[PDB]
Design a protein around this ligand. Structure first.
Ligand SMILES: Nc1ncnc2c1ncn2[C@@H]1O[C@H](COP(=O)(O)OP(=O)(O)O)[C@@H](O)[C@H]1O
Ligand SMILES: Nc1ncnc2c1ncn2[C@@H]1O[C@H](COP(=O)(O)OP(=O)(O)O)[C@@H](O)[C@H]1O
Ligand SMILES: Nc1ncnc2c1ncn2[C@@H]1O[C@H](COP(=O)(O)OP(=O)(O)O)[C@@H](O)[C@H]1O
Ligand SMILES: Nc1ncnc2c1ncn2[C@@H]1O[C@H](COP(=O)(O)OP(=O)(O)O)[C@@H](O)[C@H]1O
Lengths: 474, 451, 484, 492
């Protein structure tokens, strides 16, 4: 049994590590903290990969996920001391999780779309953020489904006065394309995406190619050039226009492309190939034998663009959008991308589910209330498990008050008392010493599907850990 | 949790290290580096540009005090000292049970109080004519006469205020001067209307990428080989001469009769210049750099009006000035951005401490205490100065503060040079409003980040 | 704070070493004497008595628990196990950040709530005519006999005409060797110590007894005194002097009647012979308690000098006859059994019975045990806790949980699933409105503790909850243990 | 200077151990007795009485505190807490370069400011009629009897004649067993010590008491000699000799008409036999104290010589009674002329809480007789005094300025500690309470460390006796001054 308590102490150590980074006064962004911190325990490795890739790619609030999981396990230990089997604790945790998720529907205030309604909600995820809200709303709406379904994913990425921030109709990419004397504007680009090397086909037998004179040296250069010309014709045989290429060719070879009118980009990175292959839909060609008119990107416009000193190229009309934040100072960016990411994510969740619950611990407290209600009407030991789930739900408001210098148990208990007395499920922690506790008066929303993903994912992690023993590491 | 007092102890150790080098009576520091010479000097700008990094917070003290202040002001030592004082008081606040967030917020509010109070203390300096010069005498007046014009040549003087870091070191040159002669003197010693071709590429024949082992037999093929690579070199000369070409600046060299190959082709060049010289010329003449192996175009060439060799070589009619033979140019630039000044010697810190104290006396939430702490933190600048001049620190500082309240003179402050009547006004100890604002705001950013 | 958590750990260990011996299926625990015998027995009173302690907190617990509850009767184990539960909950409250003083205050609140609720659970028992015993067979084959012996012994030895108190001059003498049920109630006192010199008559009518604590020594002098015998005539004069003063002692005793004369110290084998030639018969080597029992039972005197003996102070006993003392001015119970362990166990159960009777005389209200009263008090405490704002709230709820350790322990001691049985009995108690519903740790089929008759005395349970709350309050308020 | 900062660390250690035991919610401190019982109680006087006396600075604080405050008042904890606060504040002034003498002089200045401000804060209380009793309940659930017992104890042994100062003539005897309500008021004296014999009359009425300090011993020569008895007849003659002189001393006592005779020192096993058969009730082996109580209570003079007394120097206790308490027994003197309080409670340690609590009540009443002015506690007087000290501090030039401000802050340790001892946020609660004192102009507003009701200390009736607080701040300033002026601690 002790292995379970060891796991509980490990995951509890992770959650306690990430408690102080919860809330606006955190000490952060738990997504980056988990994405960077290295973990020794396998249970700590399992705290990540479940909180990171499952929640950062759907919603946000990863810190709340790991903290809630740590509280759940910490209560589950005290439940283990009474002799309750871990399967019972996990089942009760699942039942209480159902209760809370259902209570989210009862707390939820619904917001509409298509006329503001989301942009003002985006002003909360941060003048400095009105134009960014506009760019996020129009960005998601540009690549949104909206033919009911209400599911559209991140085909949108951001590149590094902020009033000059643009929405790029297609895809922006670095790398001026090989030799400036090439046509700076390719119209209807039949892109050839190649991840293959540019070397003559070397025979696979004993070489020792003893070139004895300068004449045979120049002839060797002429052969090495001839094979490359053959490659140019092998590419232009199925749609020229452009040729995205990882690997380079250097000065002598570049000309041959220019002379043969085949615009091309030199040794792009890992991305910018996947980026352009997704934008233009053209399949990548990795081999020097497997390219045709079927594996070609279908760009409508490709052009090189300068900014005084450096220059990058854009490709628009592609078969699906990017955000270009030009603002200078370069200390602002990578942080405008965080609030803008929260914008795009909150918008995506609002398209998926247009219901919001009010944060600051309010929804946590009222969910703990509902779970406690469904616990007081139950026999079997799962009763204690449900009450423990409520107590674990009440760690988010406690953690907020803690990180804001307030007395956690006192302020949390008083706020819960106000939630029961005033029938207001939006009363929570102040966190900023800013007026009242009414979160709707403070504009703190958290998108029902996001909170539901928090509770559900934390429950999944906790149940998985509540099983697991023996860890057979070599 | 305990890591806060530890990090505060480390950054405070960095501050106490540089406490003795503050003021005109500051102590020098040996500071040798890797198996080389020794550079004895005070002025914490170069001290923090060196100083091995012990803690991660110890490095965090640099580049915030260094890159944020040296590029706007110069008072880096005051920045790190003030930061160490703010953290040292922040520890005492952490003893009372204050949360660090409230300490940082109170430090921000008090910083607003002081920065705004500087506007009230500020004296105005006039521009557009001669007598910005004598002010510079505070930071053989010729240097001043050189500095002012040196900025004014590359300054806007209208409302955009950008002239940053384009000047370097008894006369002023309207362009840029660089070393490294013309490489083979038979070249034109005065290139006129120079379409400078700045290439940072190697000069080698394009070797193939397959198995070689060139087995040249009998001197015949040896001479044929030398003639071959010289032929390709001539092809390169025609690659540059195809685009303006008037002059060619190269990071790599040739180092034989290849110079003649240029001379016979009439393409003057310069051999083996460094990076922080190629960039200097490239921005000076506005000529894009060519990195790839002689894949250039006519737009990536400099357009310098005149470049000539002198008994080194000079580049004029460029764009963008150099002084032919900083402590003044920074003050001048700050005066152009904002012509308001405050009086140093710790006076501005004492009056700002008074303003923060007053604005803290009527205050609710615990940030009150923090603000009070901030005031005391500022008063470390006078005391330290007194300490560096052998005077009783708290005695002298208390007297100067009491006089600043009694006489309503926000310029009374430490006369560490033991010269005169404690006034700083008729002592000409000036500190340029933007500089002091940058000090307070920067130290506040460091402290609030460590918290 | 860490020192307080260590104190909670030591106290919790003391409780864990005790909860296994709670209830009728309680385990035994050897507890060897000081390089001597053993005493295999549950009943946490003797356990805490014979237990030596290491930690000062444990020492404090062992002193405070026996300081009151054992002087009341049963429940000495419930004090330490309930204290351990309260401290174990108080730890989980400390981890939340609640100050210890708030936990203690909430524990006092819940203590008053539960103690007030016991008055509502309470029933009533009558004390004037018999059939108190049905409440006594619960305290302990021959339960009716022992119950009648205890009730008669207490009702004989009691004020009861107001004052409502009982002073235990009841002596329980257990003689190994008998037939399990030959236990008799003797209107008088019985002690061992045979008559000195066998030829003294084993029967004294109208025995006027002289109780002495003086040594049978020649009248010694004071000051320095060095005695030098210079001739055989002075040696014989010494022996004759001591015989003279001795017979002076005997005649001095017989001047006041003195049919018998118990003495605490011994004789000389020459002494008891001179006592045989006179009609004095005496007993020797009795002992302090055994001469106090005779002192108040016979209307004695206990004089430490023979020469100051007067007839007015003699203790009258109608018949002195081990040796029995009947007809005097005081009752004793003579337990008889078989294989060395019939008694001592009969002594223990009889002690429990006498305690129950005395407490019933003090307060004739009872609550039904088996953990039922603890569950009902827990329901009341949590109910009042839901109607409380400040942090004390939590503490009160914790107190409730702490109470529910008494069922869980009992269940645990009878092989049942503690959580499941305690929860089932708590739900059955909520729905049936039956506060006399508890753990059936004897496997009798029923759960109603009114049936099966499990009694616990109101003031006994009150003393349990109050004393345990006091101990937990002290342990929670202690730090900086000096140890000079 | 390093020695001085070491002294500050030791003193502030003594303070840090005791600020947790400040207020009604103070922690208990186990402190066992060397190899015996324990004494678990929150009380600065007792905690400093035990107190691991290690550092000479700590022993110095323990010396001064009990040397004055506990001998005149009671507030022994706030002296050491405030002293530790003042030294901890003085450390940062030492680091600023301020000389210790300037610091101590500043603490004296601000201490005078606060002591003078207490007079402004002071309120009043009446005497002789029922007004003192209720404000004894605050010296703490049946404490209504505590007030009555203490007030009747001070007013029975009345000063009444003015000049207004009086203590000793009150003993508190505690016998374990019972409940707190069993505490009864006062008639005369109650001491331990059974008589001297079982058959001694347990009730000696109209007892003319003989108070002796002599031994009941036939006087020895004292010259180094050896008593050699050569025959049994001379042995008997010795017994008759010393019995004879014993009886001479007995009849020497009862010739003055002594119905009772206390002895204290010498009393053999033959002596009480000869005193019983002579019908002279007597008690032996009584301490030095509990005899002058008999001398003043029964108006008798202490007879020194081996029975050279007259009826002029005898007692006159109306009824002497021996009382049993289960197994032990005490001796009480009623109808005398000096009183004593008999306390019951049981549970081995309740009769200690209630004992020193009653002591605190008696001290409060005595201080009210001295000066019937009080300030309202709960840290209110400390906060108001801190406000005054800061007011005078901002209007001061030389470095004493800083010291004065320090003193202010030091005072505010008393509220914070209280807040800390009640689970509240100390800095926030103290700050808010002080701001409320400024706005509402209510100097009787301090930490509600009992969590019951409002904030103003006029309700809850928390009084402090002006003389007590004045002597508190004065004594703490004495400690801090002495420690500041100390270095070099030699200690051979
Ligand atoms: N303005 C606000 N006021 C109160 N609580 C907030 C506010 N903004 C965010 N929070 C709370 O902070 C919690 C965690 O967010 P944060 O600490 O920023 O990182 P993450 O979103 O990764 O958890 C959320 O549960 C939310 O309730
Ligand atoms: N002549 C002077 N009289 C008084 N103070 C001076 C004088 N010159 C410089 N100072 C003070 O010295 C401080 C620090 O300057 P210094 O130690 O030379 O390097 P840095 O400017 O990098 O801190 C300034 O804040 C200024 O107030
Ligand atoms: N026959 C019984 N049926 C159910 N419970 C019982 C029975 N006898 C005793 N108990 C329970 O056992 C508990 C402990 O009693 P015991 O261990 O004998 O001594 P103590 O009362 O000192 O703990 C009591 O609280 C009582 O409720
Ligand atoms: N009922 C109360 N309410 C508020 N404060 C109190 C109360 N009783 C005592 N105090 C405070 O406790 C402080 C210290 O008293 P205490 O802890 O009993 O030890 P001492 O009397 O030795 O100082 C006093 O300054 C007083 O202000």
């Amino acid at each position: 049994l002790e292995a379970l308590k060891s796991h509980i102490m490990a995951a509890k150590a992770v959650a306690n590590t990430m408690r102080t980074s919860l809330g606006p006064n955190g000490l952060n962004d738990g997504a980056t903290i988990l994405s960077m911190m290295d973990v020794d325990h396998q249970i700590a490795k399992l705290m990540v990969e479940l909180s990171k890739s499952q929640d950062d790619e759907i919603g946000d609030g990863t810190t709340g996920v790991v903290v809630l999981a740590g509280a759940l396990l910490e209560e589950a230990e005290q439940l283990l001391d009474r002799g309750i089997h871990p399967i019972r604790i996990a089942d009760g945790y699942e039942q209480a999780a159902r209760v809370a998720i259902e209570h989210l529907d009862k707390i939820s205030d619904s917001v509409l779309v298509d006329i503001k309604d989301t942009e003002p909600l985006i002003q909360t995820a941060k003048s400095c953020h009105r134009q960014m809200a506009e760019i996020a709303v129009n960005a998601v709406l540009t690549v949104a489904d909206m033919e009911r379904r209400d599911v559209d994913f991140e085909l949108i990425k951001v590149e590094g006065r902020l009033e000059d921030t643009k929405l790029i109709k297609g895809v922006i990419v670095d790398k001026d394309f090989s030799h400036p004397q090439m046509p700076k504007k390719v119209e209807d680009a039949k892109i050839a995406i190649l991840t293959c090397p540019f070397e003559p086909p070397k025979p696979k037998t004993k070489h020792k190619l003893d070139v004895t004179s300068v004449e045979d040296y120049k002839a060797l250069q002429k052969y090495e050039k001839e094979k490359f010309e053959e490659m140019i014709q092998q590419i232009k045989e199925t749609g020229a226009n452009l040729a995205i290429c990882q690997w380079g060719f250097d000065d002598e070879a570049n000309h041959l492309l220019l002379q043969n009118n085949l615009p091309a980009v030199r040794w792009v990175g890992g991305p910018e190939i996947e980026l352009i292959a997704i934008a233009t839909g053209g399949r990548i060609v990795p081999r020097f034998s497997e390219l045709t008119a079927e594996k070609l990107g279908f760009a409508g416009l490709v052009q090189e663009i300068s900014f005084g000193t450096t220059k990058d190229k854009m490709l628009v009309i592609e078969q699906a959008v990017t955000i270009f934040i030009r603002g200078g100072n370069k200390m602002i960016i990578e942080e405008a991308k965080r609030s803008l990411h929260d914008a795009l994510c909150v918008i995506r969740n609002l398209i998926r589910d247009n219901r919001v619950v009010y944060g600051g611990g309010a929804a946590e407290i009222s969910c703990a209330l509902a779970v406690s209600q469904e616990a007081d009407k139950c026999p079997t030991l799962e009763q204690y498990a449900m009450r423990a789930f409520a107590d674990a739900l009440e760690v988010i408001p406690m953690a907020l008050s803690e990180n804001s210098g307030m007395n956690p148990i006192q302020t949390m208990t008083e706020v819960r008392a106000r939630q029961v007395k005033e029938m207001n499920p939006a009363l929570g922690i102040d966190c900023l010493h800013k007026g009242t506790n009414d979160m709707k008066q403070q504009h703190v929303i958290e998108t029902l599907i996001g909170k539901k993903q928090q509770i559900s994912l934390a429950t999944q992690m906790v149940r998985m850990i509540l099983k697991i023993d023996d860890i057979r590491k070599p």
